[PDB]
C-alpha cells in the first residue's frame, strides 16, 4: 500500500463451545450481591443462591 | 493491588503488537487485543470477522 | 513537492562551531523524523543519526556520538546540525535527507541540496 | 553489517549491458522483504535512489533500469546504456543501524 510494506491480519469465527464447570461437596458456590469488609472482616450477602454449577 | 490484598500471576497474556525498535517513528507502540467481551456474548450463532 | 533546502558553504577554523539550517516544506514536519548525512569528498556516505521530530529526542551513529548536536524547530520546520570544536577531518558535504517511511524504512527518496563545509 | 560491491569501476559502451554486484556480510531479508537499495549519484548532485527494496522502480526513473537480488546478492542492470548514465552507484543497507551505504561503482 503506497508503495510499502502492508500486513493484515483476518480472523474469522463461526463456532462457539458451551462448557460447564462444577466444584464437588464439600465445597459450594454463593452466587449475589457479595460485600466484603476488610477492616471488620466480614462477609455479607442478603438473598444470594447456593449453587454447585 | 489495595487494602484486599495483593494478587499477581506468572502466566503469559497475549496481545498483537508491532517491535518498533529499529523502525522510524510512524511504528505504533500501542497493544491490540483481537477480541472483546461481546464477541462471547453477542450474536453467537453470527459469524465473527476481526481485520487488523 | 516535498523539498529540503540546505544553507549555503560556510567557511570555518579550527575550533569554532557551525550551525546547519534544513528547512522541510511540503509535509508536517511532526510525523517524518529528519536524517543527518556527511560524505567527505571522494568516498562514500556515512549515516548520522536521526532527530524524533515528534518528541526531539536525538539519536546519533556509533562512529558520530562524540561531539554532535541535534536540534530542530517545530514552528519553521527547519533542523539544526551542531558540530562542535571543529577538526581537519570534518571536511566533508551535510546532507538532509528524509527517509522513506515505513517497514525498516531506512532508506532516503528526498535530499537536501548540500551544504560543503571546510575548516 | 559491510557491504562489498563489485566492481570497483565498469567501463562499458553505449548499448551494452551493465551489472554491478553487491554483497552484504549478512542478510538484510525481513517478513517477506529484502532491504537493498541502489542510488544513483550524479557529481555536484545530491543521490537518487533508483531501486528501493531490491526489486522496486522509483517512480520518475526510466524503465531501462531495473532490478534483481536474492539473500545476500543482489545486482542492478542497465541494459541502454547512455552517455547519461556516467555515474557513480551505490548499494544501500536499511536493515541495521547505521543502515551502511556502498563503497561505490564507477561507470
Known amino acids: 500500500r503506497d508503495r510499502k510494506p502492508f500486513y493484515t491480519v483476518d480472523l474469522n469465527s463461526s463456532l462457539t463451545v458451551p462448557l460447564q464447570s462444577c466444584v464437588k461437596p464439600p465445597y459450594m458456590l454463593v452466587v449475589g450481591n457479595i460485600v466484603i469488609k476488610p477492616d471488620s472482616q466480614t462477609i455479607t450477602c442478603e438473598n444470594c443462591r447456593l449453587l454447585t454449577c | 493491588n489495595n487494602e484486599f490484598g495483593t494478587i499477581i500471576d506468572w502466566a503469559p497474556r497475549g496481545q498483537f503488537y508491532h517491535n518498533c525498535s529499529g523502525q522510524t517513528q510512524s511504528c505504533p507502540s500501542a497493544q491490540v487485543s483481537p477480541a472483546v467481551d461481546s464477541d462471547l456474548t453477542e450474536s453467537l450463532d453470527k459469524h465473527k470477522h476481526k481485520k487488523l | 513537492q516535498i523539498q529540503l533546502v540546505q544553507s549555503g558553504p560556510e567557511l570555518k577554523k579550527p575550533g569554532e562551531t557551525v550551525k546547519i539550517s534544513c528547512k522541510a516544506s511540503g509535509y508536517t514536519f511532526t510525523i517524518y523524523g529528519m536524517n543527518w548525512l556527511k560524505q567527505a569528498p571522494g568516498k562514500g556516505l556515512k549515516w548520522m543519526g536521526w532527530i524524533n521530530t515528534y518528541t526531539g529526542e536525538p539519536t546519533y551513529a556509533d562512529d558520530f556520538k562524540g561531539r554532535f548536536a541535534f536540534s530542530l524547530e517545530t514552528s519553521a520546520s527547519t533542523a539544526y546540525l551542531q558540530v562542535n570544536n571543529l577538526k581537519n577531518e570534518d571536511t566533508a558535504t551535510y546532507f538532509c535527507?528524509?527517509?522513506?517511511?515505513?517497514?525498516?524504512?531506512?532508506?532516503?527518496?528526498?535530499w537536501g541540496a548540500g551544504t560543503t563545509l571546510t575548516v | 553489517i559491510v557491504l562489498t560491491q563489485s566492481p570497483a569501476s565498469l567501463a562499458v559502451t553505449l548499448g551494452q549491458r551493465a551489472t554491478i554486484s553487491c554483497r552484504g556480510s549478512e542478510s538484510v531479508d525481513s517478513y517477506g522483504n529484502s532491504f537493498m537499495h541502489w542510488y544513483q549519484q550524479k557529481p555536484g548532485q545530491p543521490p537518487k535512489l533508483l531501486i528501493y527494496?531490491?526489486?522496486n522502480l522509483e517512480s520518475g526513473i526510466p524503465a531501462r533500469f531495473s532490478g534483481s537480488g536474492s539473500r545476500t546478492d543482489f545486482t542492478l542492470t542497465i541494459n541502454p546504456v547512455e552517455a547519461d548514465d556516467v555515474a557513480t552507484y551505490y548499494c544501500q543497507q536499511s536493515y541495521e543501524d547505521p543502515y551502511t551505504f556502498g563503497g561505490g561503482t564507477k561507470l
Open positions: 527494496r531490491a526489486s
Open positions: 535527507a528524509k527517509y522513506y517511511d515505513g517497514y525498516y524504512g531506512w532508506y532516503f527518496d528526498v
